[PDB]
Amino acid sequence: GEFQRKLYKELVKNYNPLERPVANDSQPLTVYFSLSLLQIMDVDEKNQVLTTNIWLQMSWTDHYLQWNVSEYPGVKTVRFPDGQIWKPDILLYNSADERFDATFHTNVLVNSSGHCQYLPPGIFKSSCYIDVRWFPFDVQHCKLKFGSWSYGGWSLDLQMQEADISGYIPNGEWDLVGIPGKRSERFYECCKEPYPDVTFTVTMRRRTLYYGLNLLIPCVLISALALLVFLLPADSGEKISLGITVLLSLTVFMLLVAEIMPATSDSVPLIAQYFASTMIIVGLSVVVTVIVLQYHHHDPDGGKMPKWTRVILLNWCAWFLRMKRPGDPDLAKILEEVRYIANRFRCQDESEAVCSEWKFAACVVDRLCLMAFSVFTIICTIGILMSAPNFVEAVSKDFA
Amino acid sequence: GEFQRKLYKELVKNYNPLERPVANDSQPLTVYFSLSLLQIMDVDEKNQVLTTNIWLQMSWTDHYLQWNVSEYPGVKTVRFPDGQIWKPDILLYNSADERFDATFHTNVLVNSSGHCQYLPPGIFKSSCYIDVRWFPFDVQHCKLKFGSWSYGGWSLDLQMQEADISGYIPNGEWDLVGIPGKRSERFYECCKEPYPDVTFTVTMRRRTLYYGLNLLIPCVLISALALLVFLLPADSGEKISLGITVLLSLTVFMLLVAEIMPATSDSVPLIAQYFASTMIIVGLSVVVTVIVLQYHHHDPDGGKMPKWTRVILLNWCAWFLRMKRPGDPDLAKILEEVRYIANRFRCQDESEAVCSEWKFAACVVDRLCLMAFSVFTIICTIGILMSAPNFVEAVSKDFA
Amino acid sequence: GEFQRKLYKELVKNYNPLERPVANDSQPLTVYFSLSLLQIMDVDEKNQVLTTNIWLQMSWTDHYLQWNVSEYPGVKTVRFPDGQIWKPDILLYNSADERFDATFHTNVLVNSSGHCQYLPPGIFKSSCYIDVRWFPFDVQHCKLKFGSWSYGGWSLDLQMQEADISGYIPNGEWDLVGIPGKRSERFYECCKEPYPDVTFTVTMRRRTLYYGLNLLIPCVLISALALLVFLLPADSGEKISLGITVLLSLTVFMLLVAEIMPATSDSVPLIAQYFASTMIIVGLSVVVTVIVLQYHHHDPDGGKMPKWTRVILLNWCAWFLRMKRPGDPDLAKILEEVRYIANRFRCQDESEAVCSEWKFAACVVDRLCLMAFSVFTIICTIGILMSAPNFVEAVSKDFA
Amino acid sequence: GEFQRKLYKELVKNYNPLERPVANDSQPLTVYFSLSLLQIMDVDEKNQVLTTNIWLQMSWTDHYLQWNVSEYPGVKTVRFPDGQIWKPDILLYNSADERFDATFHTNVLVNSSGHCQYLPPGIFKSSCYIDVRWFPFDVQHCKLKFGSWSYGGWSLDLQMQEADISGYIPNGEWDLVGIPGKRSERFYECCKEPYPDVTFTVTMRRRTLYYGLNLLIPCVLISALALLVFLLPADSGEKISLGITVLLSLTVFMLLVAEIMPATSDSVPLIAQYFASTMIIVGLSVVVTVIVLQYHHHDPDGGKMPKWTRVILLNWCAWFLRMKRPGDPDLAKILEEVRYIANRFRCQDESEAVCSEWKFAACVVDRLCLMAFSVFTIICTIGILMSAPNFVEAVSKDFA
Amino acid sequence: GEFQRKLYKELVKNYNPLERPVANDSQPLTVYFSLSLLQIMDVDEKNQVLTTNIWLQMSWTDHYLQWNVSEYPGVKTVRFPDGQIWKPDILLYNSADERFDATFHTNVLVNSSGHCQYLPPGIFKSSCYIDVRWFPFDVQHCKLKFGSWSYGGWSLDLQMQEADISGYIPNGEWDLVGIPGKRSERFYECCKEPYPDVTFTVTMRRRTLYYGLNLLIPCVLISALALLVFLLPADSGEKISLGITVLLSLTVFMLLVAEIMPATSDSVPLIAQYFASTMIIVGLSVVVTVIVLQYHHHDPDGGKMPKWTRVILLNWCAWFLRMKRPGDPDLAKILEEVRYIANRFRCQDESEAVCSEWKFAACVVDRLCLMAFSVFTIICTIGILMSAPNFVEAVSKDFA
Numbered sequence A, B, C, D, E: 001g002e003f004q005r006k007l008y009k010e011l012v013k014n015y016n017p018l019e020r021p022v023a024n025d026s027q028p029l030t031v032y033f034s035l036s037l038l039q040i041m042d043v044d045e046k047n048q049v050l051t052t053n054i055w056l057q058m059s060w061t062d063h064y065l066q067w068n069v070s071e072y073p074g075v076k077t078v079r080f081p082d083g084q085i086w087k088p089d090i091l092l093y094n095s096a097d098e099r100f101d102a103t104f105h106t107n108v109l110v111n112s113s114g115h116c117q118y119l120p121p122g123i124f125k126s127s128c129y130i131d132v133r134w135f136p137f138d139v140q141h142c143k144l145k146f147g148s149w150s151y152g153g154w155s156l157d158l159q160m161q162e163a164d165i166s167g168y169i170p171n172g173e174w175d176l177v178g179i180p181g182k183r184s185e186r187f188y189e190c191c192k193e194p195y196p197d198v199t200f201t202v203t204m205r206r207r208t209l210y211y212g213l214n215l216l217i218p219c220v221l222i223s224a225l226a227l228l229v230f231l232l233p234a235d236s237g238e239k240i241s242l243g244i245t246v247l248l249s250l251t252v253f254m255l256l257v258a259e260i261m262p263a264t265s266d267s268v269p270l271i272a273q274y275f276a277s278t279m280i281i282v283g284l285s286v287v288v289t290v291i292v293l294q295y296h297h298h299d300p301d302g303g304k305m306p307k308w309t310r311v312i313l314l315n316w317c318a319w320f321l322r323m324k325r326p327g328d329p330d331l332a333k334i335l336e337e338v339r340y341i342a343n344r345f346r347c348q349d350e351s352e353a354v355c356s357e358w359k360f361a362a363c364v365v366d367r368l369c370l371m372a373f374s375v376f377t378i379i380c381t382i383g384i385l386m387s388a389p390n391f392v393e394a395v396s397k398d399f400a
């Protein structure tokens, strides 16, 4: 329009985009900085970066970009692209993107009284400490630090407005507790100008249904299945294979969780120590199986059962476990000849009776170690799982 | 051409690219927006990102770019590159790309009466919610929200037009259902002026032939082969090995499944329920195998058959499945010896009879659990696969 | 030199890079387009993306860039960079790159009579449909569509020239068959003027030596190894272990090859059919092994075979396979004892004979199943491999 | 303000950004260069690339950018963007990014007496040698070489200032030791003028808690578990299965470690030596198990124990490891028959005695090899682990 | 400085960056081109690309950029940025980067007599044919072609200077043999002007310590381990498991080796044929083990030993292998009943002999096939390893 063209010609006359738009050069410029969270795109534990979709909000006043709306009836708002007017050089301090600035340079909305409005969008990548001590029952506090790179406090003082969460798109994995901000001042030793900056702390809680279904319950079931070696009879000849196969499956499950864990050496993860305890339990079960197999295949005349072992296992353990114990010249030549066979059969019977005791002792040890290992596994799993804080909150929210 | 040179010189006289080209500055400017779907490239379920290839279509009227073809006999249309003509700042809010705007800036073609056309191509990466509750039989809706950034409702009247799919290239994995649009007006915390936008919803259906033939049929076959542990005679020593190797195969199959799905905690996937059911069935089969093996190797003279187990197994169950049960001092001394031998043989005979009874009981239990597990597996698989909606239509389209 | 400087000053004056350089504005401008294929960089079957290194060849005539070499004795040609002279806006329609244009903008060489020559290079990524029906004996055709974006038929008369492959560098995996071109003009829903375009179809054949030696021969050899389970004597309890280990290895093989193929549900690939048939063969071998083991470990005095089973196995099939089937009162008291012992031995001998007859029946079944499975494996492999077209050509051109 | 506007207009009058701001041309321009390390983002061992977040600090004196504060009461400092004033072209020589420069060009702050400050941020990828000889117990030094490109020693006088680490953010995986700098000038084949440069050496130490808990301890546990093969009785058939499964479980660990580490062929890594030692130990254990099994299943009547073997094993070893050592006409015909039966029984008893002697020899060999293998494993593990120069430091810092 | 200010003002007056700075327009401009290699960043056999860090050296003479030093006493050099003076358009013909040009545009140094220097850095990703025929023992020649894109022989005379490697940083995997270069001319049919181009060939040698320690040694060790099945007694029942385990292990070796290699069909790699030979040897060992198990478990009544098998195995191979071959009415009724038992025992003793013969034959076969396979594996491995050229060179330079 005629009035629009005339005003656009008038405004850019003698305008210097390198100048701070203030009436008094000795006074700072009040700039209001805010934020508008849209969605949490990705949280990467290994690289320790956070990716979010954010609309920034910067607002200030311009002394030169003013006009009387009566002389320009139709026009009430003008718009300028990047590079034609002065804008704050607000940057994200802790950035992980290749190019240090990720915002998209849109237009600037200027009212009739000299009020500007800049809302650039972008996909921001920032580096924050992602603790994995209580994984998967985690709560993370990631920070976003914004501030003017070059303008100090005598020139541009930053003010904070509350972050806008309306329009947030919920994430499937993470639950947003909140996002509170804070305006802080820095005092350089040179001078006496406060340096205002705005920091936003995004606090989120992981939803643990997926991990509980895919990593914890299957490992619990595999460890419980590993307990069956103490129920298999020793004559089957399959006791070792079960345990070693369970150990191999545990190694595979270990690599599965290792490929998603950061290499940080700050603390021992809950899942890591839980896997370690389960693996130790399986190994001890394998050792006990080896000992039981040694007891079962004992040589009948390779030694005598120790008195201490007898009084420990055969009677006391049976009492505790309620396991009952199991169980004419030719005439003389013919006589000696059949007596030899009778004595041989008697010796064989005695040897078998001796071996039965060793077999019973092996069975008793098997049952006792089954009981002990089941108790140990239950106690260790319950304690390790319950040690984590907000575990009750996590289970109540996710699984119910 | 001389006419082209003269018209190009005239058209840029006192032309401001920052000015909105309207005759009356109080009236809005009508802009028509539409899409042109060319190809669906990627549907990343893990990252919830959709990649498409579309041509945006924008049309409006420029008041200043008008001329009479009588004075310029040859030229009818003109083309202006980026930076020399006014263009709407329409961009995608759902953008998941590093650079927020992913369009290729091309020329703007203009009428002899001021009608401008703008068809910029580009590959768009948006973020839409992907539902995995019914994978691989899911239907996905993904939204694309287009609208002007710094221009309010009182400046441009964004008018929606029906999307064009006349040049769509069919995808081998996703079947397009449609792409309708809706134009709505929203308020924002920034300002006090409504901001219109145009949203297009892309509806796709996943073809299930590949996922079926590569995921479900092998699982069915392996789970069915796991049932062979009940037909294997206990005299062999490979039942436990069979069970554990099937468990390992299912574990690797589950890992391959888990490495393609998002880590959401909003629902339990159908494939996850199926895999859990199969794992539970195989685990209980292994437990039953352990029980049967312990029954078969039951040492005689170490406990009699309980009456309850006797009546349940050897009397009732064997009836049910129509399986039957299997089936002079020298002479005095010599007589004593042969009597001893005969008595020992008689005791051996009664012991082996008891052993045969125990083995028959083990076989009966094996047959019972074979039948029960077969019924359980069939029912569970059928129910889990038929629970999902549109399963019949998916099967029909992808197979028949 | 002075003459070159003067000519450069003269040519630039009054020139407009926006106008179309034609003497008559009502006549179209003839532009010749051609390709120069240099290398095929990658064929991504997963993303259906083809990467090539080519040089575009564009040539036209400029009316305003003309001079007489007599007035400028030294200079014969001039070079203008991007943005200083008019250039056609020819770009690839079906681009798969984030930047829709991937051409390095070079200088434009100009005649002394107005002929312009443009040779921009670039690394082009194109989205072409890849058919995996006959993988790895398939032949692929990928299209490259070029044409002006904003210039219609009445303004820019595009023409086609045959592609140049004199500088082609052979690829290790893909063998080039040819690259023809076709020029056509279409109508678009935007406008009512035809828009011509030039399409180049790249036809190439996949070399099969690597895929053969790394996918087909190992599978054949391992299937033949799985066929060896029928020669194992039943006493050595390793048949189940052999079969299940082969099945596990082959599931691993199938799941590994599944990663280098698209998830298109358009057809069942040749390799998929091959591995499915091998799966069924090995599973049926395992089932047969279970049946044979069940027959071998039969319970004596548990029900004799049916006469039908006897005549089928030990009579007909044994002859068919040419197998030979194997095979004073004290005096009275001691007489009774010895008679009892002898009768017990006789009963033991009868039971042994029955067990041996069962074992021979099991061996006969084993031999029959070995023969049948060998025949089936050979037939299935040969049929599946020979069903694919171009198999003979691929073999005779790669292996021979 | 009016004063700011006038000063900005005055300062850029007759200014030339291509000119070096020195009052006297024959003298160099002193520039002070320093660093500001924020955090260490990534250390890629396979690609040998270090990624850091740093701020450069360059300060120099400009002769033309001076003004009197009394004439401009408000403004005390001015700021300029890129292109409008002269800046040093200081680059990182050993860059690894696709773009050779990764800094983000910010504004330049100027005194009222002409003192320019430049603090451009960026994320820098630099290629530095990575030593994996003592991995994980290793300390790495990575160089960062900065310096002007086209300015020599007679034009630019680079001066080094100590690096700042007050803003450092500790990294979990790596522990920073220090960052000293060094300034030196070199000669290049291009030119006959020295070119000074500043090199900062970042020295960091790897924290070994994660690797210790995830890599070494499981390997020690599985290696110790492999020693159980010498305690199993030879009657069972699981020794070879145990050994080979342990070998597989170690092979996959070696696979993962080789995946983690680079393919440099300048030294044998400590973890590689450890894995080779474990491989050799397990293989030798399997060979010993095979030998012991061959000794156990010795055919009686098919050979005799050599005198050397007898004296070596059955006496000296049995003392050393303290193992007990286990071990009328009709009348004549009847007499002959019973004599035959008893004679065959005697022969069977002699064969059984020979078998028992062979079994005892096998047990003695098993025990001796268990002792020897335990000693070898412990000695080798301690020797390999203790050779790291900073093993004591790692143990006393991370674990303690 | 005032002098350099006025010199910069004077030099750019009436300067056109579009023309060749030659005093005579008809005389070609001589340009000297060289290269300075610094690092071999990466070699990608799968993608057939080479990544290097390189400085380019271009030198020419500018006619218009001359001045008298006595007129400007303090100025001896001037520096110009991109787009301000004429520069050769030298490009890399066979680049593989997404952007065809991968150099960083630095300043151009001009001396007082018009001599220009240009040293742009960059990381170049070119494509070269990598031959994996003799992997790991490889020697690769990768080409780098540089030339002017749009300048002929009457315009540019591209001379050559030898490459500079004084600043080369040794790589940990590749040994730089050298970098020769050639200056080649191209003659066109149109014109008699040569078309100079400079190509540099990079000759590299792969250091084989890492590959020979991570691929060769474990393969030969596992292959030697696979020979223990013949030393294993057949009563253990684990030969099949050992063989099948080892085979399956070696597949997870061949597949993971093929993971890192290009899919070319130009030749069969040495590592591929070595792996194939090893797998074939293991498979034949498994078949022989099956045959030996068939011979061992031969029932005594299932036929008679073939005469040829007798004379061969029991005599010839036995002597050759030096294996020792092992080795009133009541009276009548009692007489018959004892003679029956005596005859039963006699028949059992007679039937044991043929079983012993079969077992001895199986042992002979085991020993003979162990002897054969031991030489087979050694011959195959040595021949395959020593077939490659410069294997002695690689060994002497890496291991020794």
Ligand SMILES: *[C@@H]1O[C@H](CO)[C@@H](O[C@@H]2O[C@H](CO)[C@@H](O)[C@H](O)[C@H]2NC(C)=O)[C@H](O)[C@H]1NC(C)=O
Binding pocket: A111, A112, A113, A115
């Ligand atoms: C132009 O836009 C700005 C937006 O901030 C207006 O400033 C606000 O105006 C309302 C109405 O009086 C007040 O309630 C707010 O307190 C003002 N905000 C501030 C920071 O002052 C401004 O008034 C508008 N100018 C015109 C002529 O409408």
Ligand SMILES: CN1CCC[C@H]1c1cccnc1
Binding pocket: D148, D149, D150, D188, D190, D191, D195, E109, E117, E118, E119
């Ligand atoms: C020190 N610089 C960097 C490498 C070469 C040298 C240089 C010399 C002249 C022009 N450009 C660069």
